[PDB]
Design a protein around this ligand. Sequence first.
Ligand SMILES: [Co+2]
Ligand SMILES: [Co+2]
Ligand SMILES: [Co+2]
Ligand SMILES: [Co+2]
Lengths: 117, 239, 361
Amino acid sequence: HFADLVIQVIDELKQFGVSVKTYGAKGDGVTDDIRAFEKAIESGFPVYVPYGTFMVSRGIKLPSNTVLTGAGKRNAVIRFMDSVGRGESLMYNENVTTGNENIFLSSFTLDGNNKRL
Amino acid sequence: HFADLVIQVIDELKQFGVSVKTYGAKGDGVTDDIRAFEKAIESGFPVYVPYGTFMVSRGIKLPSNTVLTGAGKRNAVIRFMDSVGRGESLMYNENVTTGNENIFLSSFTLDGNNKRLGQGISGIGGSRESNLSIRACHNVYIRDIEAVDCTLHGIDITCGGLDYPYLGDGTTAPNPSENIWIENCEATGFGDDGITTHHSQYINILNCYSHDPRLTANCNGFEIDDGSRHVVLSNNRSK
Amino acid sequence: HFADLVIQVIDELKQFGVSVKTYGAKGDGVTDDIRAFEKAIESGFPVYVPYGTFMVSRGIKLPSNTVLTGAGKRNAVIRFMDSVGRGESLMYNENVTTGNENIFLSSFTLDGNNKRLGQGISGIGGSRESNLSIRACHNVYIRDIEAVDCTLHGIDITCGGLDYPYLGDGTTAPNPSENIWIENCEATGFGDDGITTHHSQYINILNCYSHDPRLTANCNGFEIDDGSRHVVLSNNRSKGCYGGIEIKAHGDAPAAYNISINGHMSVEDVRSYNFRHIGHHAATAPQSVSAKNIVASNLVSIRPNNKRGFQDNATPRVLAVSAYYGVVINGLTGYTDDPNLLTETVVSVQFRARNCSLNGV
Ligand SMILES: [Co+2]
Ligand SMILES: [Co+2]
Ligand SMILES: [Co+2]
Ligand SMILES: [Co+2]
């Protein structure tokens, strides 16, 4: 509970923008973090992905005016879960038909977990 | 939120027992703190009342094996709210008919807020509406309690039942209180008596001060009344 | 770890003095807290005992200039562990032979856990195994202490030494306790006496309650015993004991002398007020040279009886005086509602009692 209060302060500082962990991401190689990504991305703030393997049960959709930056390749890693079915890219812009604008993506690994199939 | 975490730690230390503020008491002279008192008292721990005026919308009922201690007279103050109706003493033991045991009360003020009813008013019937009423109890220690603006009595020790029994001369009422100690208490501004005993035995009243009744009837400082027996009074003052 | 830091700050504030919990006390009814008590007590600070049942594997020894205060009776509770052996009072001053000074004890329960030994057991020898024992001490204030399930006595004030000395009539034992105040204390479930004094002087016992001994021998509420002198008892109550207030000595000891009873209430004791000097009652014995001066006033005795069989069914009394010279009784009320409880003599002045006066009975 003390640590949670300290974390709350850090998160309010927004040193990188907003961390996905602020919205509940675990980045533990097991937990489904898709909702945290969606929440962070819809918040309007630049989004930061810190160290971890962030498991996702569906594709991460990017709206216009998105800044998504990680701690780096093989540091911030985004990965499809074993149970994901067919049909989606791991990461793609929201409006598939007429598109989006101003998307800035930096410094992370995308692991499509093709192995699972 | 930080202060709340600090408070949580203090409360877990239980330096006095459990504070009523731990259970949500404000002690601000306005907020109804009755639920906090009830919760604290039912917890099984000795209960502490710190500085404040703790407003209560109904009587505080005491079960057996209760320790209730305050920060002191005119420091910890317990008070009926303006909107309280008729029929209850401010503080009394839970089992009104066959009584309770082992109740230890120390170091606070009981303000019955009789004022709220208008002037000239006394108890609605029998032993109802004292600041403190002890009925059919064994082993009760009452120390350093100040009882003010009382509707009926300041402190009343009686047998079981809300009413006083009238069974005739040469009788003994059922369910006496027994083994009672009243020490360093003050009673004032009462409607009947400051400190009084009925149908009860083995009582010591020591170093107490009972003065200035509100009313003008049979209003006595110390009234050792119907059915009392085996009582010592020593070094008290009445005025 | 955060809570520990907060606690550290609180402890540094020293709002009561130093808490025993600061030195590692748990007060959980299970953990041995003796080391925390010893550390706190040796620190030089006033010691505070907060809410809890603080278990102890050996007696708590008190040095000079000790302040030990609790959160209150049945709030702060100090208790012998089940596994404790024989020989120690629960709490007592460090220097058993020549004593200590300036000890101030307030607001806690002492539970001697006599139960742990099986039933029917009393002290192993002399003054050993009371809940609280004060030996050869000067300036001791004992307030708001509840003493329960006691092996020997609840509270005992005595001279130096673990044993009680038997030096003969007309003597004064070395190393008395002196300047003692016992107020608002309760003693119950003891093996011998609730509150008792020996070979000590200048003592006030005020507003205390001693009742219901475990055993059935000479088990008295207040026993002003061998070598006592210059004692005032006032506004105390005794219940369900053999003697309510006993003032006496055993044979081969000097009787208590110059004792004042300024009001007492005795409820269902056998002999409410029992003043005597064993060895100095027979017509052919020497007169006691020590049994002198008792002034006792505003005495209440209620339903004296021997339903419990104390002292081999000794016969009940409101008042029994023997051996003593110069006993002045003023304002005595004895009351019963059962004519079959006391059947021999209500008040006796016999067995070498002399120069006695009864007024207002
Ligand atoms: Co009256
Ligand atoms: Co009355
Ligand atoms: Co004895
Ligand atoms: Co003795």
